[PDB]
Short mmCIF file of C-alpha atoms in Angstrom, two decimals:
data_model
loop_
_atom_site.label_atom_id
_atom_site.label_comp_id
_atom_site.label_asym_id
_atom_site.label_seq_id
_atom_site.Cartn_x
_atom_site.Cartn_y
_atom_site.Cartn_z
CA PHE A 682 27.66 -114.29 -127.65
CA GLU A 683 27.17 -113.68 -131.12
CA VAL A 684 23.27 -114.01 -131.36
CA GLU A 685 22.91 -111.87 -128.23
CA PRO A 686 22.62 -109.00 -130.51
CA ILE A 687 19.81 -110.57 -132.91
CA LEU A 688 17.69 -111.61 -129.73
CA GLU A 689 18.25 -108.26 -128.86
CA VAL A 690 17.08 -106.07 -131.75
CA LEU A 691 13.95 -108.76 -132.18
CA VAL A 692 13.05 -108.78 -128.73
CA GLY A 693 12.83 -104.56 -128.81
CA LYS A 694 10.97 -104.52 -131.92
CA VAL A 695 8.02 -107.11 -130.74
CA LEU A 696 8.10 -105.36 -127.23
CA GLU A 697 7.17 -101.61 -128.36
CA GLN A 698 5.28 -101.96 -131.65
CA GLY A 699 3.10 -104.68 -129.43
CA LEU A 700 2.72 -101.75 -126.33
CA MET A 701 1.91 -99.24 -128.96
CA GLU A 702 -0.64 -101.16 -130.70
CA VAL A 703 -2.44 -101.75 -127.38
CA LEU A 704 -2.65 -98.79 -126.21
CA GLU A 705 -3.79 -97.53 -129.02
CA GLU A 706 -6.60 -100.19 -129.71
CA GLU A 707 -7.82 -99.56 -126.12
CA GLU A 708 -7.66 -95.71 -126.12
CA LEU A 709 -9.99 -95.93 -129.58
CA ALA A 710 -12.41 -98.58 -127.98
CA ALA A 711 -12.74 -96.39 -124.94
CA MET A 712 -13.91 -93.26 -127.22
CA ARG A 713 -16.30 -95.03 -129.48
CA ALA A 714 -17.87 -97.10 -126.31
CA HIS A 715 -18.42 -93.13 -124.66
CA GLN A 716 -19.78 -92.16 -128.47
CA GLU A 717 -22.16 -95.30 -128.48
CA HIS A 718 -23.32 -94.41 -124.72
CA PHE A 719 -24.49 -90.82 -125.47
CA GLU A 720 -26.08 -91.93 -128.91
CA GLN A 721 -27.86 -94.77 -126.95
CA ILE A 722 -29.33 -91.64 -124.37
CA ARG A 723 -30.51 -90.12 -127.25
CA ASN A 724 -32.32 -92.92 -128.85
CA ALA A 725 -34.10 -93.31 -125.61
CA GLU A 726 -34.99 -89.94 -125.13
CA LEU A 727 -36.37 -90.29 -128.92
CA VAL A 728 -38.50 -93.38 -127.46
CA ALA A 729 -39.70 -91.72 -125.04
CA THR A 730 -41.35 -88.60 -126.66
CA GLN A 731 -42.91 -90.75 -129.44
CA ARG A 732 -44.57 -92.79 -126.69
CA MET A 733 -46.12 -89.21 -125.25
CA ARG B 122 -55.05 -57.01 -125.96
CA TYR B 123 -57.53 -59.16 -123.76
CA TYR B 124 -58.19 -60.02 -120.41
CA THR B 125 -59.61 -62.92 -118.70
CA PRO B 126 -62.52 -62.29 -115.91
CA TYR B 127 -60.37 -63.49 -113.40
CA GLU B 128 -57.90 -60.84 -114.48
CA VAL B 129 -60.00 -58.09 -114.10
CA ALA B 130 -60.64 -59.45 -110.74
CA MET B 131 -57.11 -59.19 -109.25
CA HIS B 132 -57.67 -55.18 -109.09
CA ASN B 133 -59.91 -54.16 -106.44
CA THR B 134 -58.93 -51.52 -104.29
CA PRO B 135 -59.17 -47.94 -104.88
CA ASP B 136 -55.48 -48.03 -105.50
CA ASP B 137 -55.60 -50.18 -108.66
CA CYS B 138 -59.56 -50.57 -109.58
CA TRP B 139 -60.75 -52.12 -112.56
CA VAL B 140 -64.17 -52.79 -114.11
CA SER B 141 -65.15 -54.80 -117.17
CA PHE B 142 -68.41 -53.45 -118.89
CA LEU B 143 -69.99 -53.97 -122.36
CA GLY B 144 -67.08 -55.67 -123.33
CA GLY B 145 -64.22 -53.24 -122.34
CA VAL B 146 -61.86 -53.30 -119.36
CA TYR B 147 -61.27 -49.85 -117.80
CA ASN B 148 -59.05 -48.58 -115.00
CA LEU B 149 -60.64 -45.76 -113.09
CA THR B 150 -58.21 -45.48 -110.45
CA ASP B 151 -57.89 -41.88 -111.62
CA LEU B 152 -61.66 -41.27 -110.91
CA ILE B 153 -61.65 -42.66 -107.64
CA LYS B 154 -58.21 -40.77 -106.61
CA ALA B 155 -60.09 -37.38 -108.02
CA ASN B 156 -63.55 -37.96 -106.78
CA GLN B 157 -63.12 -39.12 -103.51
CA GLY B 158 -66.53 -39.25 -101.13
CA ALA B 159 -69.79 -40.97 -101.06
CA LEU B 160 -70.26 -40.60 -104.81
CA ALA B 161 -67.03 -43.20 -105.46
CA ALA B 162 -68.90 -45.67 -102.97
CA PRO B 163 -70.99 -47.77 -105.22
CA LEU B 164 -68.18 -48.45 -107.90
CA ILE B 165 -65.67 -49.26 -105.14
CA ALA B 166 -67.71 -51.75 -103.53
CA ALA B 167 -67.75 -53.10 -107.00
CA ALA B 168 -63.85 -52.82 -107.99
CA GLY B 169 -63.13 -55.78 -110.17
CA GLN B 170 -66.83 -56.53 -110.59
CA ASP B 171 -68.71 -56.68 -113.74
CA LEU B 172 -70.59 -53.65 -114.32
CA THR B 173 -72.73 -54.49 -117.54
CA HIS B 174 -75.58 -54.59 -115.87
CA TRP B 175 -75.85 -51.22 -114.97
CA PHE B 176 -75.84 -50.05 -118.66
CA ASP B 177 -77.78 -51.20 -121.73
CA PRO B 178 -76.69 -52.12 -124.87
CA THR B 179 -78.44 -49.33 -127.33
CA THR B 180 -76.85 -46.30 -125.87
CA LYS B 181 -73.43 -46.11 -123.49
CA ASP B 182 -75.02 -44.40 -120.52
CA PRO B 183 -76.65 -46.33 -117.75
CA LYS B 184 -80.45 -47.40 -117.92
CA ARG B 185 -83.10 -44.64 -116.75
CA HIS B 186 -86.76 -44.63 -116.12
CA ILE B 187 -89.16 -42.13 -114.77
CA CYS B 188 -88.75 -41.52 -111.15
CA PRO B 189 -91.84 -42.57 -109.21
CA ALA B 190 -91.02 -39.69 -106.85
CA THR B 191 -90.69 -36.48 -109.11
CA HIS B 192 -92.37 -38.24 -112.26
CA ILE B 193 -88.75 -36.71 -114.09
CA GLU B 194 -87.07 -39.53 -116.23
CA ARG B 195 -83.32 -39.55 -114.94
CA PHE B 196 -80.73 -42.75 -114.79
CA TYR B 197 -81.37 -45.85 -112.77
CA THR B 198 -78.99 -46.17 -109.64
CA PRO B 199 -80.15 -48.85 -107.61
CA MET B 200 -76.46 -49.19 -105.87
CA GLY B 201 -76.27 -45.26 -105.60
CA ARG B 202 -75.01 -42.62 -107.41
CA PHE B 203 -71.76 -42.81 -109.29
CA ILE B 204 -69.25 -40.06 -110.33
CA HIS B 205 -70.76 -38.06 -113.17
CA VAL B 206 -74.39 -38.62 -112.27
CA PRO B 207 -76.73 -35.53 -111.51
CA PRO B 208 -78.56 -34.87 -108.27
CA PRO B 209 -82.33 -36.04 -108.35
CA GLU B 210 -83.25 -32.08 -107.53
CA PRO B 211 -81.52 -28.60 -108.35
CA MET B 212 -78.65 -28.18 -106.57
CA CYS B 213 -75.53 -25.55 -106.05
CA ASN B 214 -72.63 -27.78 -106.45
CA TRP B 215 -73.11 -30.45 -109.08
CA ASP B 216 -71.08 -28.38 -112.07
CA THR B 217 -71.19 -29.45 -115.16
CA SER B 218 -68.00 -28.35 -116.80
CA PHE B 219 -66.45 -31.46 -117.18
CA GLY B 220 -66.05 -32.62 -120.52
CA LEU B 221 -67.48 -36.30 -121.34
CA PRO B 222 -68.95 -39.23 -118.62
CA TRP B 223 -66.45 -41.89 -117.73
CA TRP B 224 -68.30 -44.59 -119.45
CA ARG B 225 -68.00 -42.47 -122.82
CA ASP B 226 -64.29 -41.14 -122.12
CA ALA B 227 -62.69 -44.65 -123.40
CA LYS B 228 -59.63 -42.93 -124.94
CA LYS B 229 -58.65 -42.19 -121.45
CA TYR B 230 -59.96 -44.71 -118.98
CA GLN B 231 -60.04 -48.13 -120.90
CA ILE B 232 -57.12 -50.55 -121.46
CA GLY B 233 -57.52 -53.67 -123.15
CA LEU B 234 -60.72 -55.36 -124.19
CA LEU B 235 -62.42 -57.89 -122.41
CA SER B 236 -62.50 -61.57 -123.70
CA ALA B 237 -66.13 -63.01 -124.01
CA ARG B 238 -64.80 -66.24 -123.53
CA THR B 239 -62.15 -68.47 -122.12
CA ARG B 240 -61.06 -71.90 -122.59
CA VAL B 241 -58.64 -74.22 -120.90
CA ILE B 242 -55.40 -75.33 -122.41
CA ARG B 243 -53.35 -78.44 -121.15
CA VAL B 244 -49.43 -77.30 -122.29
CA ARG B 245 -46.85 -80.18 -122.04
CA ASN B 246 -43.08 -79.50 -122.08
CA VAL B 247 -41.74 -82.18 -123.86
CA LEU B 248 -38.38 -81.99 -122.80
CA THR B 249 -38.90 -82.10 -119.10
CA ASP B 250 -42.37 -83.53 -118.33
CA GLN B 251 -44.51 -80.96 -116.66
CA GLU B 252 -48.06 -81.03 -117.63
CA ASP B 253 -50.01 -77.14 -116.91
CA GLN B 254 -53.64 -76.64 -117.26
CA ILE B 255 -54.17 -72.76 -118.15
CA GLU B 256 -57.14 -70.37 -118.91
CA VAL B 257 -57.16 -68.21 -122.38
CA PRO B 258 -59.22 -66.42 -124.01
CA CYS B 259 -60.85 -68.13 -126.61
CA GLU B 260 -60.10 -65.87 -129.89
CA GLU B 261 -56.62 -65.07 -129.18
CA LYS B 262 -53.35 -65.39 -131.24
CA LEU B 263 -50.99 -67.62 -130.32
CA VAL B 264 -48.31 -65.22 -129.47
CA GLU B 265 -50.15 -63.93 -126.77
CA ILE B 266 -51.02 -67.77 -125.92
CA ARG B 267 -47.33 -67.85 -125.46
CA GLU B 268 -46.88 -64.46 -123.45
CA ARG B 269 -49.11 -66.33 -121.14
CA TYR B 270 -47.13 -69.31 -121.35
CA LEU B 271 -43.77 -67.45 -120.49
CA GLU B 272 -44.83 -67.47 -116.89
CA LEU B 273 -44.41 -71.24 -116.96
CA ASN B 274 -41.21 -70.91 -118.96
CA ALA B 275 -39.05 -68.17 -118.41
CA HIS B 276 -37.44 -69.56 -121.97
CA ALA B 277 -40.51 -70.09 -124.06
CA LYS B 278 -39.28 -67.95 -126.58
CA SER B 279 -37.16 -70.73 -128.08
CA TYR B 280 -39.18 -73.71 -127.72
CA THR B 281 -41.40 -74.63 -130.79
CA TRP B 282 -45.26 -75.21 -130.27
CA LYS B 283 -47.30 -78.05 -131.74
CA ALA B 284 -50.69 -79.37 -131.94
CA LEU B 285 -52.86 -82.25 -132.44
CA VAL B 286 -54.09 -80.78 -135.72
CA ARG B 287 -56.17 -83.00 -138.18
CA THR B 288 -56.12 -88.10 -139.66
CA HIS B 289 -54.63 -86.42 -136.65
CA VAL B 290 -50.78 -85.37 -136.49
CA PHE B 291 -48.81 -83.29 -134.43
CA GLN B 292 -48.50 -80.84 -136.88
CA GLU B 293 -46.58 -76.87 -136.76
CA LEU B 294 -48.85 -73.83 -135.30
CA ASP B 295 -48.48 -70.43 -137.01
CA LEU B 296 -48.39 -67.55 -134.53
CA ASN B 297 -50.62 -64.99 -135.59
CA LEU B 298 -53.36 -67.60 -136.19
CA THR B 299 -55.54 -67.92 -132.80
CA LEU B 300 -56.31 -71.39 -131.40
CA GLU B 301 -59.71 -71.67 -133.69
CA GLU B 302 -57.80 -70.80 -137.07
CA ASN B 303 -55.12 -72.90 -136.09
CA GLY B 304 -57.34 -76.29 -136.12
CA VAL B 305 -57.70 -76.59 -132.48
CA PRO B 306 -61.09 -76.39 -131.94
CA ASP B 307 -63.36 -75.55 -128.84
CA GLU B 308 -66.05 -78.11 -127.85
CA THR B 309 -66.99 -76.92 -124.22
CA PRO B 310 -70.45 -76.01 -125.41
CA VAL B 311 -70.99 -79.38 -126.84
CA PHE B 312 -69.43 -81.04 -123.92
CA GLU B 313 -72.32 -79.18 -121.53
CA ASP B 314 -74.93 -80.04 -124.18
CA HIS B 315 -74.04 -83.44 -123.94
CA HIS B 316 -73.28 -83.96 -120.15
CA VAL B 317 -69.52 -84.21 -120.44
CA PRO B 318 -67.35 -82.92 -117.50
CA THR B 319 -65.71 -79.72 -119.39
CA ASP B 320 -62.71 -80.98 -117.30
CA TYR B 321 -62.89 -84.97 -119.26
CA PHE B 322 -61.03 -83.62 -122.36
CA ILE B 323 -58.84 -80.70 -122.74
CA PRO B 324 -56.94 -79.64 -125.95
CA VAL B 325 -53.07 -80.21 -125.62
CA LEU B 326 -50.28 -78.20 -126.93
CA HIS B 327 -46.86 -79.98 -126.85
CA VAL B 328 -44.09 -77.55 -126.63
CA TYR B 329 -40.84 -78.78 -127.54
CA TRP B 330 -37.13 -77.59 -127.29
CA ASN B 331 -35.08 -75.91 -129.92
CA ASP B 332 -31.42 -75.84 -129.11
CA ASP B 333 -29.92 -72.41 -129.03
CA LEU B 334 -26.61 -71.16 -127.59
#
């Protein structure tokens, strides 16, 4: 009955902070992968022109 | 400007008649329109043809000879009597009020100038690979080569040109210098003289895109 509020506080901190961190890490990873994909396309096109 | 022989050949009809002679391309349409008889036959029958054999170089008038029948010097017209040629005998209908013969009235009946030679350029669009052979006069500035190529790409103005100038590296080409000044030589005479087909190697012009918006 006395340890309940401490548990509630610490658990809330852990849950919200972990969830926010995972969402933001995933979101940046997706965007940077998209940019790398476009850069890969551009590099392949460069190689084709050099070959010709 | 200039015209390849095939380009002159495209206009062969009493409605649009073009003739090339002595290096000049002439649009004789208004002649045939204003003189429609047996006089217009010998050049209607040679519409779009090369008419230099009619004339001689030293003077711009047609060739002359001593007529065998009358022994009086007059134009040699084996094809027939074209417009502005007097009848052999004294007639009562051939007026001489008109000013100048059509082979002398350049200002009113000459458009452009016939190309003495033509060459094959192989244009290659590097972005979207599309090879294309084409024939252009061998003495023409790259601006009008671009104008010829504008029928292949309607957006060729934005594109940038490049040629394998000399080792050999793909370098930029100035627009106001002809294909010979820019370092793209012509070797078809050497090809022929050495028994190499004139379609074995063709000079190549790369056409890159220049991003715009």
